[PDB]
């Protein structure tokens, strides 16, 4: 993340991460809200970062 | 569905004799891609009395080929076109013969 | 006071790599000849010792022309829908076009 | 959720190889030795097994 | 013997002003027996030439050696007897002639081989040629 | 075969070499490792950490791609899917984590 | 009507039930590419194409289960003689037929507390013994796991009753009908390594430029101090060896040229069709396509 221009990292870490389609919830029978969305086969990346390993949230 | 083989009211191959150049035609083949057009043009280039062999797709989304043949005298587009198709059919015969021979050497 | 339509991203790259490869073979030439117009001119190099005929890429550029063009330029010379001479300058290529 | 059948790029069937993958990692193997033991040579399938997130269990617990 | 011009030449300066391409060079030649000045753009992959070599150049207006002025185009044909006695042939177009040459030196003949250029400098015994009319073939040997 | 193909005119202007380095790192992770018979278990000197302010060097990534069997420059030779003959320019391939965004149209 | 015909040659290196390799030569590149594209997208296969769900009470959804059912490979050896279901006079009843439309059945339920999983081996087929689900990835091969392709996992109050109908298709309609799962070829190189330049440069430089190769193409014969090509077919055309020869300035040392002929195939299969049956069906569909495009009716 220290290789990219700062504007690109601002984009990714403020807007595009907050909009990507992925996990939603683990009990969808109770969340009655407008426009819940979800993939079929979510994944983790091939690489590893420090914080994703210490947090252990995929 | 409708993307596949040509419906009623349209020929599979449509011939067209070119007007401005002698020994010249344009074969508009329906329902094909690079698979047949490529082997047709590369068989045509091994002929003697041919001069120009190409194919192109009028839009890359639409599923049809237009082939063009310029030839010399002592021949025509029709003769070299049918020569190409028949010799490719003979090579597929000889290839199927070779492959069914080579399967037998795994003798069970 | 200029043209509102100039050659964009990939097209100018195609012209650059076509300039650095000045000669074409027979098969690629006749394949490219299907697109524009003006069938095809006679080959520049009609024979050599090793290969067959060989084309230049200026003859390939002729296929997009209209009929009976005659205009004088800084590097380009067009007489009768043919591209007679074309200057070296790859640096000014978006201007000579 | 569950492992996908048909590795997205090439098309090899991998939809049965999940439990033997967990057992080979359970025994003592690292991931390279496990994928070489199951016999996945091209990396388009190796990226499909190594990065699978298995979320069916969390769904099974939260139903009733 | 359908030949407009035929002579022998010697090369003395490769790369006159700048080597514009990887495989195209301008070659300076100087004649003998007619004494002339001679520039030419040559493919230096299929036929490169060192400095201080010799080559005999021809100029046929039509390649098949029977006076039939058709363009032909059937040069790799089996045997219909064209002028393939020589080794390097390239068709082209003459586009500007200056046999007026209203000063001390001789004529200027500029042809274009579809993008390759030739400079032949000489008035005497060259007055067969025209301004337009792409018929020149430029046969090179040795 | 690739799953997504993008244009090489996007990289020299927008100044993101991190995407090329990420693709090379992940391609060096997911590949097998030859010459594994003897002398090592041959899967232990494998870098998986692209931590932001403490990142692997270029030599680590390129020597890993040399160990995995591929070319050190990141490229890879391909053949065309239409003409079928050798494309002259070597192509840069490798996996990348992409995302799908909302407000579809 | 002259000859105008080149004569191919086949020689097989390896051949198993789902694998092959053969050294096709004396044919052009476009023919090999035609074989590749027909085997990837033109050769047909039977696969599931319609699903009626009566009860679904699992944590998955209907389209997820139908999508997983569509990709389960069925053995298709009578699919060359079947017909496309748009071309059948009968069978307009959304059910079983005899020239298309094999029908399947599936029901499962868990009454224990042991997390029952529903696999591919619970699909029971009417019109049996001709298109069942595939078993070669379980039995007849000790590859990974005999349990087969997992579809759902279930709990107590959960069940799944449906009825699927397989049909015929090709890979251009959907990816579920493509039987290839690997079809590729490659050229094979002609390496003409000089010996009068190789004895010039020194032994450390020899062991350096052998080391720059990313695949073991060359070998260092230390007993005669020379080098040796031991495997041409692992060369991958990345020029790193000749580039380090360029950086070392020793030109004319090695040269590498792809031969025009000699196309080494490598064919795999999902197990719906055998490998040699794929090659022969490809040659037959190329003959049918070359048959349907003739203008022999009107010569002039
Ligand atoms: Zn694969
Ligand atoms: Zn029916």
UniProtKB/TrEMBL annotation, chain B:
Q: Which UniProt keywords apply?
A: Coiled coil, DNA-directed RNA polymerase, Nucleus, Transcription
Q: Can you tell which superkingdom this protein's organism belongs to?
A: Eukaryota
User: Start and end of every DNA-directed RNA polymerase RBP11-like dimerisation domain?
Assistant: 25-97
Name listed for the protein in its UniProt record: DNA-directed RNA polymerase RBP11-like dimerisation domain-containing protein
Question: What's a GO biological-process term for it?
Answer: transcription by RNA polymerase II
Give the molecular function GO annotations.
DNA binding; DNA-directed RNA polymerase activity; protein dimerization activity
Q: Which GO terms describe its cellular component?
A: RNA polymerase II, core complex
Name its cellular compartments: Nucleus
Extract the coiled-coil ranges from the record: 78-105
Q: Which InterPro entries match?
A: RBP11, RBP11-like, RBP11-like_dimer, RNA_pol_Rpb11_13-16kDa_CS, Rpo11-like
Where it mainly occurs, coarsely classed, is nucleus
Q: Identify the CDD domains for this entry.
A: RNAP_II_RPB11
Xref: SUPFAM superfamilies: RBP11-like subunits of RNA polymerase
Q: Which family does it belong to?
A: Belongs to the archaeal Rpo11/eukaryotic RPB11/RPC19 RNA polymerase subunit family.
A Pfam family: RNA_pol_L_2
TrEMBL record, chain D:
Per UniProt, which keywords does this protein have? DNA-directed RNA polymerase, Metal-binding, Transcription, Zinc
Recorded hits in SUPFAM superfamilies, A to Z, give: RNA polymerase subunit RPB10
| One cellular-component annotation, GO | RNA polymerase III complex
Q: Where in the cell is it found?
A: Nucleus
Keyword Cytoplasm, does the record have it? Answer: no
Family annotation (InterPro entries): RNA_pol_su_RPB10, RNA_pol_suN_Zn-BS, RPABC5/Rpb10
> What Pfam family is a match, any one?
RNA_pol_N
**A GO molecular-function annotation:** DNA-directed RNA polymerase activity
* Protein's UniProt name: Uncharacterized protein
- This protein's species is Brassica oleracea var. oleracea
From TrEMBL, chain E:
Q: What is the lineage of its organism?
A: Eukaryota, Viridiplantae, Streptophyta, Embryophyta, Tracheophyta
Please give the superkingdom of this protein's source: Eukaryota
Give me any GO biological process, just one: DNA-templated transcription
Instruction: Please name the InterPro entries in this protein's record.
Output: NA-bd_OB-fold, RPABC3
Q: Would you indicate the residue range of the signal peptide?
A: none
Keywords in UniProt for this one? Answer: Nucleus
Q: What GO CC terms are in its UniProt record?
A: RNA polymerase I complex; RNA polymerase II, core complex; RNA polymerase III complex; RNA polymerase V complex
Q: Which organism is it from?
A: Brassica oleracea var. oleracea
Q: What is this protein called?
A: Uncharacterized protein
Q: Per the similarity annotation, which family is this?
A: Belongs to the eukaryotic RPB8 RNA polymerase subunit family.
From TrEMBL, chain G:
Keywords, ordered alphabetically = Acetylation, DNA-directed RNA polymerase, Metal-binding, Nucleus, Transcription, Zinc
The record's Gene Ontology cellular component field reads: RNA polymerase II, core complex; RNA polymerase IV complex; RNA polymerase V complex
Q: GO molecular function: any one?
A: DNA binding
Localized where? Nucleus
| Principal location class | nucleus
List, for all copies, the residue spans of the domain called DNA-directed RNA polymerase RpoA/D/Rpb3-type: 19-296
Q: Which CDD domains match?
A: RNAP_II_RPB3 (cd07031)
Q: Which SMART domains match?
A: RPOLD
Q: Which domain of life is it from?
A: Eukaryota
Which terms does the UniProt entry file under GO BP?
A: transcription by RNA polymerase II
Q: Which Pfam families match?
A: RNA_pol_A_bac, RNA_pol_L
Q: Cytoplasm as a keyword?
A: no
HAMAP family given for it? Answer: RNApol_arch_Rpo3 (MF_00320)
Q: Which family does the record claim for this protein? A: Belongs to the archaeal Rpo3/eukaryotic RPB3 RNA polymerase subunit family.
- Under which name does UniProt file this protein? DNA-directed RNA polymerase RpoA/D/Rpb3-type domain-containing protein
Q: Which organism is it from?
A: Brassica oleracea var. oleracea
